[PDB]
Design a protein around this nucleic acid. Structure first.
Ligand SMILES: [Mg+2]
Ligand SMILES: [Mg+2]
Ligand SMILES: [Mg+2]
Ligand SMILES: [Mg+2]
Ligand SMILES: [Mg+2]
Ligand SMILES: [Mg+2]
Ligand SMILES: [Mg+2]
Ligand SMILES: [Mg+2]
Ligand SMILES: [Mg+2]
Ligand SMILES: [Mg+2]
Ligand SMILES: [Mg+2]
Lengths: 50, 47, 82, 58, 100, 122
RNA sequence: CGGGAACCCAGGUGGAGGCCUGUAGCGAUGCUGACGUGCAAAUCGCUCGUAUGAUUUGGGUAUCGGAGCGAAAGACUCA
RNA sequence: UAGCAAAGAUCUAACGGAGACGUUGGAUACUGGAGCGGGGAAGGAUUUCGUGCCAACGGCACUCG
RNA sequence: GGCCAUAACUGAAAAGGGGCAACAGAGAACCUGGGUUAUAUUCCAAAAAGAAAUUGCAUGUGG
RNA sequence: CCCAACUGCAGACCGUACUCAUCACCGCAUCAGGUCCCCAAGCAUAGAAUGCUCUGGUACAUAGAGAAAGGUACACUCAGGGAAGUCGGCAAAAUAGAUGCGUAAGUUCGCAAGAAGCAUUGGCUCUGAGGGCAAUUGCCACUCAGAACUGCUUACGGCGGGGAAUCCAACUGUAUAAUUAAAACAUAGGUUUGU
RNA sequence: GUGGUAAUGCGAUUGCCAGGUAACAAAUCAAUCCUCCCACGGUGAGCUUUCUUUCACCAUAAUCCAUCUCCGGCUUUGCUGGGGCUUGGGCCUUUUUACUUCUCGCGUUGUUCGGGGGCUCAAGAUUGAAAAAUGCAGCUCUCGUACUGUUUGUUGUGAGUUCUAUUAAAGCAAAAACCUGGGG
């Protein structure tokens, strides 16, 4: 709630950044296979627990 | 951060409050000794 | 208008250690810790455990800095014996 | 904060080297002398015309 | 002998405050002013009188100030001019009205 | 157009809570142009965002009984609901009534009767 | 303590107790109530048992698979 | 189609809006200080905030989330 | 060659190796006032909005 | 020499938003479940009971139009009779608070017992006492008691049905989480064995 | 280091030993605290066909300083001492209680101590500083502008203080740091 180690804090911060959409300069690339991010977590759906 | 300020921006720093943001990035608030105007550094540093 | 209060610090438990409720000059009634008033300087438990006169019940911080004559009389075995 | 109960010791500790400021105060029923040393503020509250005297110079 | 007066601002000059108005501030100050025990006649209990606008009385018993603030607020309501002026103790013993 | 923000923090400036802040409805573009708790403090100073008076929870009904329950007309055989040792305790009508018989006999060792065997005989 | 050569008659005081009523807490008797494609892979309602205790509860900490732990139901050990 | 039936009844103005919705005012309420309160631990870790937005998600809807 | 001073490198007795384990035990030097869209016993700068306590090292008035 | 008091400089690391629940956690989910702690107003009242209120919070749990049958209720009454219902008084009623009067059998003398059983309750004006402050009547108390007065024999809420027996277990206790709360387990006691 | 017959007062330091604090379950009971009430007096808004005043507000933080003078002496020039606030303790000095006395607390007990002064002790108040320029807020007027009010008393309940009873074949943690002393 208020106690999280800094290491456990560094690992949720690395997840708050991974939870951004694919930028719309990626899907005009020549031959990419990416249309969606397909690794977006939602805090309710699935939990990280770390 | 105080030493670094003085080494980079030749201004004094009194209170350096810090915080590790929810991005893993450590912000820093820095009082400039009331003798170095802060609005004369953001205009120098180009903020 | 009867405000309720908070445990201001990070301990929100009612242990005999916290024991906090005072009105404020801003009328923002809010509660503060106490000191745990220690029993004072005593004789040895074997020898009829009794409080020593001329000695105070200072805590670890008050005792560590106050003068030495606040905790001992000028006798022999003063501050250990009555 | 201490309250100097003296005109000699006050004018001594009020004329010291710290002297962050000396805020002249006017309040009902008295006139108060707040010297701001580095760690206390020493007051000398008085009920007399001696307020305006030691106000000009101190 | 507490002197608890009552003022009159622009709602005296600009507002319609004359004998037709203040003569109700004279009657009610005796007819609506309560007395000890039995209420009403206000001449034998606590001395009162009228002036230009100062309506101070002279009482030597338990005798309040917010008391007059609603007697007038009932007089300022018996004239329907409850919005045309607001009673207010601008002093330390007398009240001073003002418009809105 | 929605005044949720200006109403949330004006209740945090007036320090009252909602259903106490009165946002003037006849003008919202005045309130909507606030978007900051200093631009709202200015608004509070002006007409637009008063705090309405709290309420009048009467108590004269209670002091009507408190006036009629110190001299008489107290509870009766059918108003009691708890035992007399629970309404008027037994252990404290002795306590007081015995403080008094001792607060009176220490009064009577000042200058009253012999106070050795006419005090502790009693 | 009052009152009468034994120790009874009563008056208080005091506030004990795996005592009683009862709130929370913890339980789950009855309705074989209501749900039974649930609110719910065991819940809901009312009733009900207990409620200073061999009590309830938090965190920590011990003991587990041919084993542990059990006021013992072969109960419980991540449905 | 079963159903969306335990737990608080929304009523109105004028306002916004592409439009039952929201906001403000007023009204009647409900929680009722073992709370639809204010703070924490465990746990969750951006859910906070603002400004948008309204495709699908909020078992009705939404201009709101 | 000793007034005085830091330092080296020895080595004075001294039994019982360390080390974790408590965000409810112990311990723990700060209190109000106020100017965030969201943080405040955390922020406020010099009529510190103030007022304290306190640890470290220092210069120096007291013996 | 040594310390304080006065100054002077500096005071580092991490946590800190939000949540803590009928939307944030676990339950597959915005689930009627579960989940530790603090703060805790007024009145009725023995009162964390229950009822209602001030503060704070909330009226986006689908909504509308209606008299079916049938159904479900923290929903009711029901003439006369009163368990004839039913495996069975299951359910429901009833009992009820307070005060006063009384209260058997049995018994391990503690109990049984709130036994059973009666009786009075309102509202009102009063009159009684019951107390702190000094040379006798001055000033800072709502509790009970009684009187008449009047009027309900019709009145929130909350709040035991009781008695007589037989059986079993002595008792409070625990216990088959998700059909078994018992007469089972425990238990104190008693004895035994080993050492 | 030096004073008081004595309880004990006051002044500016490095290793052993001995103690102490930390360190203690729940009870019952009396003041602060805060909550609430009431009587206050003051402010704002509410009611008014009526009837009346209902409700709100009135705040004092940590950390400090000293018990103002009763009195010497009512301020000569001000001593002999600047002691005092009270009620719960623990004691100290000085004079006593034996015919059973006595002191007790709401209460299960104290003496084999009973009064007069003192010494401390922890609650706790008080003046003073902080501290009013704060803050709540009304106002006369016009974020400017000023000033007028900056009030305590009562009750009741409560949390700790108070008294290291009661269940005990239950007796109701430990340690650091810290503190004092003996030797130093
Ligand atoms: Mg001790
Ligand atoms: Mg129960
Ligand atoms: Mg934990
Ligand atoms: Mg839920
Ligand atoms: Mg899962
Ligand atoms: Mg409300
Ligand atoms: Mg019938
Ligand atoms: Mg019959
Ligand atoms: Mg001990
Ligand atoms: Mg009392
Ligand atoms: Mg030890």
């Amino acid at each position: 709630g208020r106690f999280k180690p800094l290491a456990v804090k560094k690992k949720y911060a690395k997840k708050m950044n991974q939870n951004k959409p694919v930028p719309y300069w990626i899907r005009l690339r020549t031959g990419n296979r990416i249309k969606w991010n397909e690794k977006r977590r939602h805090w309710r759906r699935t939990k990280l627990n770390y | 951060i105080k030493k670094a300020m003085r080494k980079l921006y030749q201004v004094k720093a009194v209170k350096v409050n810090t915080l590790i943001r929810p991005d893993g990035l450590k912000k820093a608030y820095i009082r400039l000794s009331a003798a170095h105007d802060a609005l004369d550094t953001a205009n120098k540093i180009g903020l | 208008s009867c405000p309720r209060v908070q445990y201001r610090r990070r301990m929100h438990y009612a242990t005999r250690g916290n024991r906090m409720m005072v009105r404020t000059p801003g009328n923002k009634l809010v509660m503060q810790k106490r000191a745990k008033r220690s029993q004072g300087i005593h004789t040895p438990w074997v020898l009829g455990h009794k409080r020593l006169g001329g000695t105070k019940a200072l805590r670890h911080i008050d005792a560590r800095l106050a003068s030495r004559h606040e905790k001992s009389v000028s006798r022999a075995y003063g501050g250990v014996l009555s | 904060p201490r309250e100097i109960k003296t005109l000699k010791e006050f004018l001594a500790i009020c004329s010291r080297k710290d002297a962050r400021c000396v805020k002249v105060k006017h309040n009902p029923s008295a006139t108060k002398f707040k010297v701001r040393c580095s760690r206390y503020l020493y007051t000398l509250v008085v009920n007399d015309k001696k307020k305006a005297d030691k106000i000009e110079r101190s | 002998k507490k002197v608890f007066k009552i003022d009159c601002s622009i709602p005296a000059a600009d507002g319609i405050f004359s004998e037709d108005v203040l003569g109700n501030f004279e009657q009610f100050f005796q007819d609506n002013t309560k007395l000890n025990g039995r209420k009403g006649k206000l001449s034998d209990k606590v001395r009162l009188s009228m002036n230009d606008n100062v309506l101070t009385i002279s009482t030597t018993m338990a005798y309040r100030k917010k008391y007059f603030k609603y007697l007038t607020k009932k007089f300022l309501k018996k004239k329907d001019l409850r919005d045309w002026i607001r009673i207010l103790a601008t002093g330390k013993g007398t009240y001073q009205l003002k418009y809105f | 157009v929605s005044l949720k923000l200006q109403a949330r923090l004006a209740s945090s400036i007036l320090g009252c809570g909602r259903a106490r802040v009165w946002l003037d409805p006849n003008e919202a573009v005045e309130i909507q142009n606030a978007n900051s708790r200093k631009s709202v403090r200015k608004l509070i100073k002006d007409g637009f965002i008063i705090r309405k008076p709290v309420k009048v929870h009467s108590r004269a009904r209670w002091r009507k009984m408190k006036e009629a329950k110190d001299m008489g007309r107290h509870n009766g055989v059918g108003r009691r609901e708890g035992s007399r040792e629970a309404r008027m305790p037994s252990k404290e009508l002795w306590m007081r009534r015995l403080r008094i018989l001792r607060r009176l006999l220490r009064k009577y060792r000042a200058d009253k009767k012999i106070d050795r065997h006419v005090y502790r005989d009693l």
